[PDB]
Structures are given as C-alpha cells and as structure tokens.
Scaffold this active site. Structure first.
Site, PDB file in Angstrom:
ATOM      1  N   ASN B  15      -6.056  -6.286 -51.797  1.00 38.57           N
ATOM      2  CA  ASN B  15      -6.422  -4.990 -51.968  1.00 38.57           C
ATOM      3  C   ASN B  15      -7.192  -4.498 -51.001  1.00 38.57           C
ATOM      4  O   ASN B  15      -7.438  -3.118 -51.078  1.00 38.57           O
ATOM      5  CB  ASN B  15      -7.000  -4.595 -53.597  1.00 38.57           C
ATOM      6  CG  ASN B  15      -5.937  -4.378 -54.667  1.00 38.57           C
ATOM      7  OD1 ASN B  15      -5.536  -5.137 -55.491  1.00 38.57           O
ATOM      8  ND2 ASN B  15      -5.388  -3.413 -54.440  1.00 38.57           N
ATOM      9  N   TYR B  16      -8.001  -5.313 -50.356  1.00 38.29           N
ATOM     10  CA  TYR B  16      -9.009  -4.817 -49.349  1.00 38.29           C
ATOM     11  C   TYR B  16      -8.855  -5.681 -47.947  1.00 38.29           C
ATOM     12  O   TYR B  16      -9.014  -5.196 -46.867  1.00 38.29           O
ATOM     13  CB  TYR B  16     -10.269  -4.683 -49.863  1.00 38.29           C
ATOM     14  CG  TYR B  16     -10.452  -3.461 -50.923  1.00 38.29           C
ATOM     15  CD1 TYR B  16     -10.381  -2.222 -50.432  1.00 38.29           C
ATOM     16  CD2 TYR B  16     -10.325  -3.775 -52.118  1.00 38.29           C
ATOM     17  CE1 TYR B  16     -10.684  -1.320 -51.514  1.00 38.29           C
ATOM     18  CE2 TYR B  16     -10.233  -2.588 -53.197  1.00 38.29           C
ATOM     19  CZ  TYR B  16     -10.648  -1.530 -52.794  1.00 38.29           C
ATOM     20  OH  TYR B  16     -10.742  -0.465 -53.480  1.00 38.29           O
ATOM     21  N   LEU B  17      -8.966  -7.029 -48.279  1.00 37.58           N
ATOM     22  CA  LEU B  17      -9.195  -7.963 -47.042  1.00 37.58           C
ATOM     23  C   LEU B  17      -7.963  -8.129 -46.398  1.00 37.58           C
ATOM     24  O   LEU B  17      -8.023  -7.858 -45.013  1.00 37.58           O
ATOM     25  CB  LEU B  17      -9.700  -9.313 -47.710  1.00 37.58           C
ATOM     26  CG  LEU B  17     -10.764  -9.210 -48.580  1.00 37.58           C
ATOM     27  CD1 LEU B  17     -11.268 -10.834 -48.893  1.00 37.58           C
ATOM     28  CD2 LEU B  17     -11.970  -8.579 -48.076  1.00 37.58           C
ATOM     29  N   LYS B  20      -6.395  -4.704 -44.488  1.00 38.52           N
ATOM     30  CA  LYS B  20      -6.997  -4.452 -43.210  1.00 38.52           C
ATOM     31  C   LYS B  20      -6.018  -4.820 -42.027  1.00 38.52           C
ATOM     32  O   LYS B  20      -5.605  -6.137 -42.003  1.00 38.52           O
ATOM     33  CB  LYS B  20      -8.416  -5.134 -43.240  1.00 38.52           C
ATOM     34  CG  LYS B  20      -9.243  -4.337 -43.843  1.00 38.52           C
ATOM     35  CD  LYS B  20     -10.651  -5.146 -44.102  1.00 38.52           C
ATOM     36  CE  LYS B  20     -11.754  -4.638 -44.904  1.00 38.52           C
ATOM     37  NZ  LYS B  20     -12.972  -5.306 -45.150  1.00 38.52           N
TER      38      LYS B  20
END
EC number: 3.6.4.12
Lengths: 472, 57
Positions: B15-17, B20
């Site tokens: 969800n974020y790492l 990217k």
DNA sequence: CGCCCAGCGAGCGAGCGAGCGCCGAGCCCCAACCGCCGCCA
DNA sequence: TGGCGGCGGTTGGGGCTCGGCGCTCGCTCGCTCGCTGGGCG
C-alpha cells in the site's frame, strides 16, 4: 460500606513519563512475564506484559501502604487495570474503614511520595495528574466521591477484554470475575436483573417540614406566618427556598385532599375541662336541646356514621344559633364553600374542592336535587361546574342553615314539593327558633374544636330519626 | 512524542512501499519468499500489489 | 551531675471541605399585531 | 342584490430559574521541631 475511587495513571512511555530512569528498572519490568490462570477465557495477545507488571507493582505497593497507614488489614478493595484511549490507568477501590474523608488527602499524598521514592526511585511521573482521587465534581469544588458496592458491577465489570487487562480484589463475591469474561457478564446480568427513595440533608428536613405543616393545619402563606413569622421567613430566603414554599403548599393541599375523614382535622387533641363556657353549649341549651345529644349527633354526622341520614338541617330565622356555628365551622376547616342558591344552574360553584358544603340562607333548587340526593344519601356522583369540567364529590357532611322550609324545592319560576319526603328522610331537623342576643359574640375555632372533642368524651346512643330529641 | 507507534500488518507493504516508483526507491532487503522477488524488480512489485488488491477486494 | 529520654506542647502547612458567584442555557409570562366575526343600503 | 368596524390566538423578547463550573474562604491533623523536667540516685 463505601469506597473511594482512586485513579492512578500507569506510565506507558518510560522514556517520556520517566526521563532518566535506570536501565535495571526497565530490564526487570520487561523480563517479568505473566500468564493467565488455567480457567481464563481472556486472550493474552491483547493484554500487555510490561504495563501489566507495572500496574501490579503499583497496586501492590498502594495496598501495602493503605494497610500500613489505616491499620485495617482486613479491609476490602477492588483494583482493575484498564487501558484508556490515550493512557493507562486503574480504577482502584478502597474501603473507608479507619480512614475518614478529612484524612484521605494526606494519605494519598503520602502513598504517592512513597511510590515515587520506591518504584520510580525519586523520579516523579510527568503525566497530567498521574495520582488523584475521583471527586463528586470536577475541580477543587466537589468532594471525595464515596461510591457504593453497586459501583463495581455498574462501570468496572461491564467493561470487557478490549478495555480490560487485569484486576485484583479480595472480595469473595468478585473472585472468579478477576480474569474471566463469562463471570463478569453473569454478574452484570444478575445485577441488572436485581434492580425506591433518596436520602439527602436537604430532603430530610423537607420531609419533616411537609409533615409538620399538615399537622399544624397550614394551607397558605398567612397560616405559616400565624404560627411564626421568623420560621416562614427562614424558608424563603433564596429562590430555591421560595419555590420550595410553593411546592410544599401544593403537596400539602393535594395530600389534605386525600386524608380519610374531615373530623381528622376538626376533632381536637386535648380533652375539655369547661364546656359551659363554650358558646356552642349555650347556643344549644338556649334553643331547647340537650347539648350532649346535639354533640353526639354532630359527631356522628361529621364522621359519616349515619350514611344516608348523614345530614343536619338547622331551621328557624337566620342567625338563630344556626349561622354562628356554621361560620365558626367554616373558619375552622381548611376550605369551605357557600351554596349559591341564587345560581340554580351551578349553585355548587363555590363548593368546588371543598371539605364542607355550607348552605347559608338558601332555598333548595330542583336543577341539582337529584345529584344532591346522591351526596346526601351517602353516594358518589360527578356534578358539573360553572364553566369548568365536572368533578367527583365524595360523601361529605352537608350543613343547611336557612329560614324558609327547605321542602319547598324551587324549580325556576315555580315551586314543588315532590322532593319533600326524600329530602326529609335524610336530614335532621333542628328547630332553633331562639334568637341570640346582640352581645352574644361570635364563636371561635377553638370553641368548635372543643365542642367536637367533647362530643367524643361523652357518647350516647344516637337514634336515626328526623326530629332530634330536645332537652327535657 | 507521546503518540503511539505506527503498527500495521502485511497489507501496509503493497500500500505504500511497493507502489513507490523507481525514483522513490533505491534498494531493499527482506527474507519472505513472496516479497524476496519484489526487492529490486518493479514487475514483481506490481504483481504483488495487484495480488493484494485482488485479495482485499 | 550535665545529660537522658522523653514527655509536652505549638503550631503547621498541604490537604479537606462547603458555600457562594457568575455565567449558561432553558423555560415563561406578556404585549403589538393578524384571522375571523358583527353592522346597514 | 353589495362592503366598513371590532375580538382570541400568536411569539418572540425581557425576565425568572435551576444547574454547572469555577473560585474562594474556614477547619484539620499526622508531623515536625524544639523546650524542659524527674531521674540518674
């Protein structure tokens, strides 16, 4: 037995709440592991470890200091370690045995100092009021909140696993409910199924004042001043005391509306020692009537003992030993009402919510003869009112004091006599034709009270008849 | 400083790492057999992101 | 014989109130006007 | 076939009210810190 709800915030962040704490303390707090009992359905994953040990040490030291300073090792307590929305706390509870409310503040500070010097080792937690006691009101106004045993199952036990972490208590009624959700839920359900007045220093005096008012016979502000002006003024200094006056007046009125019998207030307390001086005695002896028999008849009529014949009718011209006694009775009783004989539509307009029905120089009307016969013959009936809803008039002793023949019931612009025997078979004829002198003086309330009391000290067989026996 | 730490589950990675992109990434080290392939490979990262999106759905 | 508990006291400040004050909304009664009706050819 | 005059309701506004919170005065009581007194005898 009451309890004190003490709030002890458990430092969650040892770095921020306890800056500069030695590493040995943190190591010992983290190395101590805990495990729920075998018969414990609580989930250990949700419960913490180091905070649990911290809370256990804190509550143990608190209980030790309390038992040491109160000299009551057998005192009951109830500790519950929870997890607040932003900081840990505990709902500690300690009995008031050996510790009054005026000494709890010093003991709390002493326990806090001891805990800071022992556990934290001088370092004082930097949490907003980490050590305090629940008060009845926020701030320095309200005092110590002395809860009851019902406070545990009303706030502590309802909380479940999410907000619960641990609990310690010596009470036998809350042993299995320490680390078991089933037992806590069962106790909460039992308490809810089990569950009236309130005791207060402000209501205890009011409960006695309202009882003393009815005992003295006060039903307005003037009656209160008649007894003692200072007493009445004391109960109306502030607005809260002023509204209390109106509340007490309304309650006393609504209660007097439901006593049991009118004689309860008319009959005197102490006996009579000189009845000859009473004006009623002379009025009854002048018209040619035995005072004893007349008093017995009056007592039987006021006590609803006759039932159907529970009515008295004084005949002869006005003010002939008939109007004085009736006026004195009306002034003695709390409320009264004159039968408006002129208003044939609503003659009982003034006799609304009254204890006695007085008919002063008034003839009988045919518009309310049938309804009046019910109340006169010992029967209930809801009659109308003057521009007002009807109201039930329970059997009440009616008194007639007229000069013309009441049998001549008027029916508008005519007269009839059909209601002669029906009305005569339920009333007593008192031929009081003797006129009182100008210097006779009006009868007082104490005189009527003494008369009604003497009527009880000398009881005689009252015969149910129309013509009352005269004084031979 | 008194606030709580950022505790999350395995769904925080995709969800974020992983979302990217390269300019917002340089290197990574892990040990999970499922995430080991998505270290320096963008295709594996996108595949894991799509798998997580289909699972949560 | 110049100290001994050691017994006494006089505060003594950090508490406890409890009692009032000053808002704070929250009901409550009252007055300047709207709807509908009486009044004549 | 036609219009010109008053009476019960409002309905917010000035006002009383009961409560909350907030503060500000009396009481207190285990603790402290000396002062001194039979007794050593």
């Amino acid at each position: 037995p009451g309890f004190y709800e003490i709030v002890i915030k458990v430092p969650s962040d040892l770095d921020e709440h306890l800056p500069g704490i030695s590493d040995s303390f943190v190591n010992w707090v983290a190395e101590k592991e805990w495990e729920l009992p075998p018969d414990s359905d609580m989930d250990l994953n949700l419960i913490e470890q180091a905070p649990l040990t911290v809370a256990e040490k804190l509550q143990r030291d608190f209980l030790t200091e309390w038992r040491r300073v109160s000299k009551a090792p057998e005192a009951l307590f109830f500790v519950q370690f929870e997890k607040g929305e932003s900081y840990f706390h505990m709902h500690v509870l300690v009995e008031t045995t050996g510790v009054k409310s005026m000494v709890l503040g010093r003991f709390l500070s002493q326990i806090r100092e001891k805990l800071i010097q022992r556990i934290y080792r001088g370092i004082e937690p930097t949490l907003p009021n980490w050590f305090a006691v629940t008060k009845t009101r926020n701030g320095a106004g309200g005092g110590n909140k002395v809860v009851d045993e019902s406070y545990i199952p009303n706030y502590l036990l309802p909380k479940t696993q999410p907000e619960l972490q641990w609990a310690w208590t010596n009470m036998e009624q809350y042993l299995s409910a320490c680390l078991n959700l089933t037992e806590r839920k069962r106790l909460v359900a039992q308490h809810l199924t089990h569950v009236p007045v309130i005791r207060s220093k402000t209501s205890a005096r009011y409960m006695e004042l309202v009882g003393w008012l009815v005992d003295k016979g006060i039903t307005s502000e003037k009656q209160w001043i008649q007894e003692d002006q200072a007493s009445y003024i004391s109960f109306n200094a502030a607005s809260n005391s002023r509204s209390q006056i109106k509340a007490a007046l309304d309650n006393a009125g609504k209660i007097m509306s439901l006593t049991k019998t009118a004689p309860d207030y008319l009959v005197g307390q102490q006996p009579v020692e000189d009845i000859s001086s009473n004006r009623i005695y002379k009025i009854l002896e002048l018209n040619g009537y035995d005072p004893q028999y007349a008093a017995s008849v009056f007592l039987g009529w006021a006590t609803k003992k006759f039932g159907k014949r529970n009515t008295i009718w004084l005949f002869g011209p006005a003010t002939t030993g008939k109007t004085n006694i009736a006026e004195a009775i009306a002034h003695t009783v709390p409320f009264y009402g004159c039968v408006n004989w002129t208003n044939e539509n609503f003659p009982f307009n003034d006799c609304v919510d009254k204890m006695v029905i007085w008919w002063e120089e008034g003839k009988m009307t045919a518009k309310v003869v049938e309804s009046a016969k019910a109340i006169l013959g010992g029967s209930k009936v809801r009659v109308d009112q003057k521009c007002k809803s009807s109201a039930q008039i329970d059997p009440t002793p009616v008194i007639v004091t007229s000069n013309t023949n009441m049998c001549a019931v008027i029916d508008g612009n005519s007269t009839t006599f059909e209601h002669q025997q029906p009305l005569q078979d339920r009333m007593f004829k008192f031929e009081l034709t003797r006129r009182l002198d100008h210097d006779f003086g009006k009868v007082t309330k104490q005189e009527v009270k003494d008369f009604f009391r003497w009527a009880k000290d000398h009881v005689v067989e009252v015969e149910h008849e129309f013509y009352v026996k005269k004084g031979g | 400083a008194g606030g709580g730490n950022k505790v999350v589950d395995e769904s925080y990675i995709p969800n974020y790492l992983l979302p990217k992109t390269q300019p917002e990434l340089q290197w990574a080290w892990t040990n999970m057999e499922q995430y080991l392939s998505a270290c320096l490979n963008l295709t594996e990262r996108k595949r894991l992101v799509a798998q997580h999106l289909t699972h949560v759905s």
